[PDB]
Amino acid sequence: KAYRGGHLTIRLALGGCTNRPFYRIVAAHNKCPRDGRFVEQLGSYDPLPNSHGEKLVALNLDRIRHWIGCGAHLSKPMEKLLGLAGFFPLHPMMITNAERLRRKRAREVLLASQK
Amino acid sequence: PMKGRFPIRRTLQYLSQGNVVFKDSVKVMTVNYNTHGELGEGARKFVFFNIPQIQYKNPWVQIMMFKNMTPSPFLRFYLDSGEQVLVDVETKSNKEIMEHIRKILGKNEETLREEEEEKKQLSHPANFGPRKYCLRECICEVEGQVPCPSLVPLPKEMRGKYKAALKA
Amino acid sequence: KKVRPRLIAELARRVRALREQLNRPRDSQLYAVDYETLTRPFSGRRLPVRAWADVRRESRLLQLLGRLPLFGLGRLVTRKSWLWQHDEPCYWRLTRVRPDYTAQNLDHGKAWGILTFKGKTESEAREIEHVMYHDWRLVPKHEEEAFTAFTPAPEDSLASVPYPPLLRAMIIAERQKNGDTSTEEPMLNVQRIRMEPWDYPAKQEDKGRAKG
Amino acid sequence: VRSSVHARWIVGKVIGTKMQKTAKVRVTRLVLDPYLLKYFNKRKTYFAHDALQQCTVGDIVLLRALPVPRAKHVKHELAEIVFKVGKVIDPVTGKPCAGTTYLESPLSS
Amino acid sequence: QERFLFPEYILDPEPQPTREKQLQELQEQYLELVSAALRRSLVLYMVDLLDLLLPDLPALVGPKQLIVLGNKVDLLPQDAPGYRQRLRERLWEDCARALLLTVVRDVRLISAKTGYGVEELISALQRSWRYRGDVYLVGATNAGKSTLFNTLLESDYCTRATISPWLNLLKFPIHWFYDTPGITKENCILNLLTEKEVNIVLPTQSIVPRTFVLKPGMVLFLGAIGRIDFLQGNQSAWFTVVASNILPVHITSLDRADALYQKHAGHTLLQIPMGGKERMAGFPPLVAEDIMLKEGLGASEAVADIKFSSAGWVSVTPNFKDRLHLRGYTPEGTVLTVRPPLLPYIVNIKGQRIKKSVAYKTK
RNA sequence: ACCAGAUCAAAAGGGACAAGCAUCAAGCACGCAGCAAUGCAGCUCAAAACGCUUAGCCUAGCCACACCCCCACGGGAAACAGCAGU
């Protein structure tokens, strides 16, 4: 199907059954459906901690580099995952959400203590 | 039973046995041979037995035959570069002809193995998808990870049906 | 196998093209505004909240040029947004103008100027953007030199930055595998990257236009 | 080289010469019957441009894809008359032959 | 820098160039002159099968041998097996109504356009003693006399053609064949229609019946020439239009039928006539004619064919025991005719209802 | 961010590509040469042309439709084949 515009984007396809999310890191034409056709699958991601308490992430770094070079963009979740991986700098919103969480914790601690 | 002499010729197991895979340069092959002649018996047997294998292994290489066009039998390959390779087959057995053509125009086992590696690259184990393409459909298949909800119900803590209950 | 030609499809395409061409709306129509509802009458869309005060209080570039000789050609025009955002002088030289005469007060149209941003000028005059916006202001003939007096601040900046941890590790490992035991840190040059403020004027020449 | 036509080189049989400078060549490809697994001579018609009009009905010809289709159907040019009808020269011995019998014996020269 | 153009000597464009038009471009005398000669031999009377002068033949030609030729048979759809035999029979009863079976010795069905039956007609002509002397080809204007004459001339029947005064007419030797002037038809929509309109109306390809299921209080429009209003019907019914495939058929309610008629007169929705309001001003208004249909003979046998002169007809099948009231609107000058069904089993050939639309898929 | 060639993939050209019916056997311009005039009179087809009937397909998905008039200027007419619902 001819697409008017659009561009490659490295993103996540939400597979897995209900209440059991699981993501396939794929490089697909941005206009294509979320779980639909995709140019190439670059890895996978399991949000639910496994028996070892690990959120497994597989990133085919070679192909990820190749596609970023070819000009694929990066969805915010993928940028955050790469930042956690250390392949990219920590996302500004990751840092700022950490700080917001810290302030929330400080506020809640103060409120609980000031009974 | 299967019809015709040497019905084995009409089985994939035999057709795939062809070891001759022409280089991409070859585009056409013409087999001139005589239906009679003791010397041409080798060429006749070659046409009867091996040509099907060559064609099966080289679907795009056109193959055409010519009965009793010239006193002597021969093959002639026309390459993409316009070159013409004339191969004499008189007095040769079909096996000898096959080996000669393999030597002079067939891809070597090294090239074939290289093609095999290029092909197998596609089947990345780490990828997940329908059995048709990837080994595992969902990471749940991997042991240690949270198993699929269908086979094993998730804890009430993880099911969103009760996260909303907590929300209330 | 032969296809049946789509004559009516071709006619529709050509007719729509011609209709758009011959009824191409005027600027005074497209970029009108209702200062009561802050809605553009032509399309009926309401302007975003953050532009309400600016639309009510400030004036447009051509709305100013209409009160100058040669449409103020050769004057320096600055934007209120620029003045608020940056302490450095930013403005256009306004080399050329082309108003929409059809407007009653000739307060719409196009302009071309030499951009000076943050006190750094450009090499050529190009088309303006956001002409239709309301955040424009005029540099008075007097005070022009004092206002545009810009002291070039020291521009020296980081030549390179560290790689992200994993990329650094990958590069180092590849080097060691190749035997390149040079322990010098791997750095990523950034001078090549010309960072520009998000509000920097864009190429109006490649911008689109509204339609009816 | 970078021809837009599909089949670069094809050997066929001339089966018509009722078109100016154009010869109607029939090309036969062995095709695998998916069921019987026997190969059959599927045939297709091609038009070869012949400037010299040297094609004769029954000749075996080699056709080279033109760089671009020069007509609604003319997509090849006659590269070489492989076997002039009834004037076959044994490529092996280069001597003329009539069927399976040499005209000039190879020992002639 | 600067330039100017001159409001004098101007060259100017036009308003509303209307490329739509461009694409529209892109995409008694016989009695008093000829009967005297004829009544001095064989007569070939050509009758248009679609249009069904016969009773006046005894005075026109006199008491001589006559052969009936039903023309334009190929354009008639095959409603049911043996329809050719049924048509031959129908012609036979029509002649009996009007004549000895003047004597008519043979009734045959021919199609000059397709050359169907012409050779058999020639063989019959040459096979028997009874057919000796000259041949006079009599018929109406649209019957196809010209086509049949050309066909016979281009055949072994003739021993090339000459023109002789009777009025100069064509002839060829066989004794001489005589092609008489065509008898013009009165009250014909073709007379009102122009050359292009007549060409469109006249079917050049085999007709495809178009069936439509209609409930009481509805209206059908065959071009802008014919209209039918179905009402006072105890049950729904089916109407099969047999007309030129390129004649639009439009179905509407009785309320909107008029307003649509004025709005779309001419134009393209009702492609006949053409010229818009200009042509419609001269075009006669559609006068009304009331009709009552007999008991509905099932849902497969037509009860009546309503013919709008030469444009076409509509076969009506009501439901069993159902009696329907109809009002046919036809141009003032021309006439509307209710006749026994020419193709009574034409309703059967059809497909299936498409959407809520009354139309049936055409087979 | 620009260019880069890279990636993606239209239109166009070549090839490939469902089922039944021959009680669908001829299609009727379906070809070629020439810069053009113009000439040549050819082209497909019992190895199934042409035509009628049925069907979404070769499923990470793909093709097509978007109420109808194949299209949609225009007209018919007021459109859930988006979700929930009648």
Ligand code: FES
């Ligand atoms: S298929 Fe993987 S969680 Fe169910």
Ligand SMILES: [Mg+2]
């Ligand atoms: Mg549509």
Ligand SMILES: [Mg+2]
């Ligand atoms: Mg609907």
Ligand SMILES: [Mg+2]
């Ligand atoms: Mg619904």
